[PDB]
Design a protein around this motif. Structure first.
Motif, mmCIF file in Angstrom:
data_model
loop_
_atom_site.group_PDB
_atom_site.id
_atom_site.type_symbol
_atom_site.label_atom_id
_atom_site.label_comp_id
_atom_site.label_asym_id
_atom_site.label_seq_id
_atom_site.Cartn_x
_atom_site.Cartn_y
_atom_site.Cartn_z
ATOM 1 N N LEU A 50 -20.393 -3.044 -9.316
ATOM 2 C CA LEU A 50 -18.992 -3.429 -9.492
ATOM 3 C C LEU A 50 -18.830 -4.126 -10.839
ATOM 4 N N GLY A 51 -18.164 -3.466 -11.788
ATOM 5 C CA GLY A 51 -18.112 -3.987 -13.140
ATOM 6 C C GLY A 51 -19.104 -3.263 -14.026
ATOM 7 N N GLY A 53 -19.419 -3.165 -17.554
ATOM 8 C CA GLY A 53 -19.622 -3.602 -18.919
ATOM 9 C C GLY A 53 -21.099 -3.534 -19.266
ATOM 10 N N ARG A 57 -24.148 -1.743 -17.072
ATOM 11 C CA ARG A 57 -24.758 -0.517 -17.578
ATOM 12 C C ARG A 57 -26.268 -0.669 -17.693
ATOM 13 N N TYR A 73 -17.564 0.945 -9.774
ATOM 14 C CA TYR A 73 -16.147 0.879 -10.055
ATOM 15 C C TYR A 73 -15.925 -0.104 -11.191
ATOM 16 N N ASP A 74 -15.004 0.249 -12.072
ATOM 17 C CA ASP A 74 -14.538 -0.619 -13.136
ATOM 18 C C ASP A 74 -13.163 -0.111 -13.519
ATOM 19 N N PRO A 75 -12.117 -0.924 -13.412
ATOM 20 C CA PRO A 75 -10.770 -0.407 -13.699
ATOM 21 C C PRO A 75 -10.497 -0.206 -15.179
ATOM 22 N N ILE A 76 -11.399 -0.629 -16.060
ATOM 23 C CA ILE A 76 -11.230 -0.418 -17.495
ATOM 24 C C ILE A 76 -11.872 0.885 -17.960
ATOM 25 N N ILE A 77 -12.953 1.290 -17.324
ATOM 26 C CA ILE A 77 -13.745 2.444 -17.726
ATOM 27 C C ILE A 77 -13.282 3.662 -16.952
ATOM 28 N N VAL A 81 -16.407 8.278 -18.785
ATOM 29 C CA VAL A 81 -17.258 7.357 -19.537
ATOM 30 C C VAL A 81 -18.418 6.876 -18.672
ATOM 31 N N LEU A 92 -12.836 1.762 -5.007
ATOM 32 C CA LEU A 92 -13.557 0.705 -4.293
ATOM 33 C C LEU A 92 -13.725 1.026 -2.818
ATOM 34 N N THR A 106 -18.789 -8.234 -12.923
ATOM 35 C CA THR A 106 -17.441 -8.420 -13.432
ATOM 36 C C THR A 106 -17.297 -9.805 -14.042
ATOM 37 N N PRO A 107 -16.310 -10.007 -14.908
ATOM 38 C CA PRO A 107 -15.920 -11.379 -15.231
ATOM 39 C C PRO A 107 -15.380 -12.029 -13.973
ATOM 40 N N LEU A 109 -12.320 -13.462 -12.559
ATOM 41 C CA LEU A 109 -10.888 -13.324 -12.791
ATOM 42 C C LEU A 109 -10.164 -13.496 -11.470
ATOM 43 N N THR A 112 -11.142 -10.697 -9.263
ATOM 44 C CA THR A 112 -12.544 -10.598 -8.845
ATOM 45 C C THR A 112 -13.048 -11.791 -8.042
ATOM 46 N N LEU A 115 -14.139 -10.786 -4.443
ATOM 47 C CA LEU A 115 -14.198 -9.332 -4.444
ATOM 48 C C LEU A 115 -14.910 -8.812 -3.199
#
Ligand SMILES: CC(=O)c1cccc(NS(=O)(=O)c2ccc(C(=O)Nc3nc(-c4cccc(F)c4)cs3)cc2)c1
Length: 190
Positions: A50-51, A53, A57, A73-77, A81, A92, A106-107, A109, A112, A115
């Motif tokens: 989860l996350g 970045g 990776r 899952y990552d809502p930015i990627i 990618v 999710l 994840t950060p 936030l 999160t 989560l």
């Protein structure tokens, strides 16, 4: 930097699969309990990340070398990618029931905090194993304890806590929980 946290994360996954901290404590107590510590082969098991970045990776490519199926899952990627570094992105709600192991990167936030909670723990496979080497609070600690007491979560590895050092000892003292005093960045190289 990122590699120290990724390496600790992978080490936590191994320790959950084979119960090394518990086995070492048992040996130092003078016991030889081979049956109690029957573990899990990681090859072919599913790791949910989860996350996605840098640290997520790095964990993915290390655990892929063990033959783990890496989903996440990552809502930015975008899924295209994530596929490029071997993580199959799903919604999710599709992730929870598939995972043998879940690790969060994840950060911290609003989206999160908690989560993993009572709702999402219930969507997991019975016996899921959870790792939090990111930030305390991403895994809801009260929900985690409930999942551990029921068997819904078979084990957890925590490097971080909502309070550091933690004042509530219920998680740390649980037999299926392994923990460290926020060592994620604690290498001379980092
Ligand atoms: C590699 C590449 O081409 C590329 C393309 C675009 C951007 C980047 N940059 S990046 O890789 O540094 C990067 C930076 C930040 C994040 C990130 O903020 N992720 C978050 N996840 C959640 C999250 C919420 C709910 C559930 C859950 F599971 C996760 C919240 S915020 C992810 C990746 C790189």
């Amino acid at each position: 930097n990122s590699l120290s946290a990724a390496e600790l994360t992978c080490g936590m996954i191994m320790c959950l699969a084979r119960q090394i901290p518990q086995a070492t404590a048992s040996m130092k107590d003078g016991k030889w309990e081979r049956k109690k510590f029957m573990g899990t082969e990681l090859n072919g098991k599913t790791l949910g990340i989860l996350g996605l970045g840098r640290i997520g990776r790095e964990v993915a490519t290390r655990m892929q070398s063990f033959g783990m199926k890496t989903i996440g899952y990552d809502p930015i990627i975008s899924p295209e990618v994530s596929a490029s570094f071997g993580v199959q992105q799903l919604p999710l709600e599709e992730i929870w029931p598939l995972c043998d192991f879940i690790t969060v990167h994840t950060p911290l936030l609003p989206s999160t905090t908690g989560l993993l909670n009572d709702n999402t723990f219930a969507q997991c496979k019975k016996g899921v194993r959870v790792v939090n080497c990111a930030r305390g609070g991403i895994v809801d600690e009260g929900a985690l304890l409930r999942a551990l007491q029921s068997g819904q979560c078979a084990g957890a590895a925590l490097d971080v806590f909502t309070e550091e050092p933690p004042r509530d000892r219920a998680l740390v003292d649980h037999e299926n929980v392994i923990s460290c005093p926020h060592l994620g960045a604690s290498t001379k190289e980092a």
